[PDB]
Amino acid sequence: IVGGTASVRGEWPWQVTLHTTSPTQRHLCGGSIIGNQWILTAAHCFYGVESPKILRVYSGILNQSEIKEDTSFFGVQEIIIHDQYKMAESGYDIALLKLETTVGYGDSQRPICLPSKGDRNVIYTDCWVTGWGYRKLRDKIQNTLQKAKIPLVTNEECQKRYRGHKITHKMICAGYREGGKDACKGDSGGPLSCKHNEVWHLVGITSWGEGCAQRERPGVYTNVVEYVDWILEKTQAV
Ligand SMILES: CCOC(=O)[C@H]1CCCN(C(=O)c2cccc3c2CCN(C(=O)/C=C/c2cc(Cl)ccc2-n2cnnn2)[C@@H]3C(=O)Nc2ccc(C(=O)O)cc2)C1
Predict the structure, then answer these.
(1) Which range of residues forms the domain containing residue 27?
(2) Which residues are marked as active site?
(3) What is the effect of changing residue 124 to H?
(4) CA distance 112 to 98
(5) Are 221 and 233 contained in the same domain?
(6) Domain count for the chain
(7) Which residue of 161, 198, 207, 217 sits 20 to 30 Å from the alpha carbon of 171, by its own alpha carbon?
(8) 18, 172, 192, 208: which to mutate for ligand 1, most atoms within 8 A of CB?
């Protein structure tokens, strides 16, 4: 996160750190708890991930230093990538992780609400991007979970900023016209959380952008509202 601030423990209880174990264990992507066995994240995180066996999901983490060999995690039983996904820049950058065990909910870990299909027309004024990603392009994974309040950008305005790309209504953009606050390397897969009527909603999934928090280069997020039926299809299968 560029131009971010240290989060308070339990500020974002749906935020998870997804680690890979190959060749060595390290943070790979962010993710969000959406159900007691479900993590919503980005499809691009799994490039070259041959097996769910190398994945570890940690919930209730503020600091990466809380993670050692003795720290408990959730194993991933299945990786479900949208089958229209080719690349982040083309959309469908969404994936589900089915966990091997059930997440117990508490003040340290709980799910975020998906946005309502009825609320597809509402305007979110209190949106935050979170993660352990870089503070600038040439940086490193941060110990403490960072947060940044960023305004949503219209599709029309986002499309002007990305000449050469096709910004669809399945994408949602965010960032200040002047830059300075946004996602960066290692934040992808994480949530773009918006508070509406005292309830936090998973409005987006950190996906892609040209550089980190550059002037007139807003962050591009998977527009979760457009995938609620796909999420329900995969998580409520009979
Ligand atoms: C950054 C875009 O890069 C690419 O598309 C290529 C180069 C990187 C690998 N590529 C992937 O597709 C790929 C595969 C797997 C994971 C990732 C990528 C690339 C995208 N990504 C981001 O987080 C996206 C940030 C991002 C998001 C928004 Cl909304 C706006 C601007 C952003 N950035 C623009 N430039 N940087 N960020 C991941 C990453 O790089 N994670 C990461 C990085 C470093 C370490 C570490 O431990 O140091 C650990 C995790 C291809």
Answers:
(1) 13-111+227-238
(2) 44, 93, 188
(3) In FA11D; transfected cells contain reduced amount of mutant protein and display decreased secretion
(4) 16
(5) no
(6) 2
(7) 198
(8) 208
